[PDB]
Each structure stands twice: as structure tokens, then as C-alpha cells.
Amino acid sequence: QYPVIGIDDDEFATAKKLITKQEVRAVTLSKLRLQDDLVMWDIGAGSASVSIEASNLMPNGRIFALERNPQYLGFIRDNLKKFVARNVTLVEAFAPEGLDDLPDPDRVFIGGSGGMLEEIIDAVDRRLKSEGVIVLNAVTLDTLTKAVEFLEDHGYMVEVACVNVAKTKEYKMFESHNPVYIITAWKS
């Protein structure tokens, strides 16, 4: 038995710095404005933690987890079978390659672009359904800069939320995670 959202980060097969951590994952899910029956793309899925929890939010939605890295693909395989996330389909693809075969998306999360950010945004803009939402998480200045630029260029309203989290595990010292910029884009 796992919670609907808020699965502990340690339960995912992952690498250091790869996982969308629990708290930011929850905010990311929230920004995606999910409802049942939608199609969602998770570009650069990593460990697929965002996909897995989104699948719990949309039991009859369809989630397409895209990842090109062989090590990460192994993580995802192990996770999808641990968490019984049957409405998630793993797709081996270097986005924007592999998107043409996917059904039109209501929701797109961009966890990793692999140097292809502008190309992914353009490809997604052409495919995104009416009332669609794009969410990206960014930890670097260049990705933050360029994502805001490219989304605004396509006429998206854009919100940027910078989320800082510090936690005590005794002696309770607050340890900070690095900041995550959750960028949310839609048509008004």
C-alpha cells in the first residue's frame, strides 16, 4: 500500500540529483491541473516519479513517460512494476523524436530536455490540445531563461514559482534542497 501522492523518495529506484523530490513533485502535480481521462506526456521522465503519482491522480488517464538514457530506463522499468502504474507507458525516445506516435496531449511535463528545449517546446505547442497545460521544472538559469522566452514566444501565459524547501530529519538542523523553478504555461 502506497499513498496516492507523497510516496517517499527512497522507494523509487533512482540516482542522486535525478528524482523530482516529494515536495516539489506535489507542487508540480498541482500545477499540472490534472483531472481523470486526460493524456499526459512526461518528457525526460528520469525515475518516472511524476508519472507514477500522476497515474494515481488520473486512474483512467493515459501517461506517456519518455526517457532516452539506458540507466534511467532501467529505473523506470523497476518503478512501474513496483508501483503497479498500469496506465503509464514507457517510451524510449530522445524528445522531440518519438512524439509523433503519441496521442495528442492535454498535459505535458518537461523534466529533462537533453539539450533539446527549444525543439521540444515547438513540437509540444503544435500538439497540445485545447485547455492544455505545460509544466517544466528548472534548476539552472539558462533553462529558466530560455523556457520562459520560448513559451512566451508561442503566446503562453507563464507563471514561475520558485520553491525552496528546508527540512529537519534529535538535533534538528534545517537542511535545504536546491531551489526548483516550476514553470507553468497555458493559453488564457
Query: Of 127, 159, 133, 165, which is closest to residue 144 (Cα–Cα)?
Result: 159
| Minimum CB–partner distance for residue 100 and a copy of itself (Å) | 28
| Minimum CB–partner distance for residue 133 and Cl ion (Å) | 19
Which of residues 7, 20, 109, 148 is near Cl ion by CB under 5 A?
20
Query: Of 71, 79, 78, 17, which is closest to residue 54 (Cα–Cα)?
Result: 79
Q: Cβ distance 107 to 46 under 8 Å?
A: no
Which of residues 49, 56, 137, 184 is near Cl ion by CB under 5 A?
49
Q: Does 47 bind Cl ion (CB under 5 A)?
A: yes
Dist CA 48 CA 66 (whole Å): 9
Dist CA 10 CA 187 (whole Å): 36
Q: Cβ distance 125 to 108 under 8 Å?
A: no
Nearer to a copy of itself, 55 or 69 (CB): 55
The binder of 49, among a copy of itself, Cl ion, none, by C-beta within 5 to 8 A per type, is Cl ion
Please state, as a whole number, how many other Cβ atoms lie within 10 Å of the Cβ of residue 167: 11
Q: Does 143 bind Cl ion (CB under 5 A)?
A: no
Residues that bind a copy of itself (CB under 8 A): 1-6, 22-23, 25-27, 29-36, 57-58, 139-142, 144-145, 148-149, 152, 157-179, 188
The binder of 3, among a copy of itself, Cl ion, none, by C-beta within 5 to 8 A per type, is a copy of itself
- Give CA 116 to chain center in angstroms: 16
Q: φ, ψ for residue 154 (rounded to 5)?
A: -90, 10
The binder of 30, among a copy of itself, Cl ion, none, by C-beta within 5 to 8 A per type, is a copy of itself
| Minimum CB–partner distance for residue 48 and a copy of itself (Å) | 17
> Can you give the binding site for Cl ion, defined by CB under 5 A?
19-20, 46-47, 49
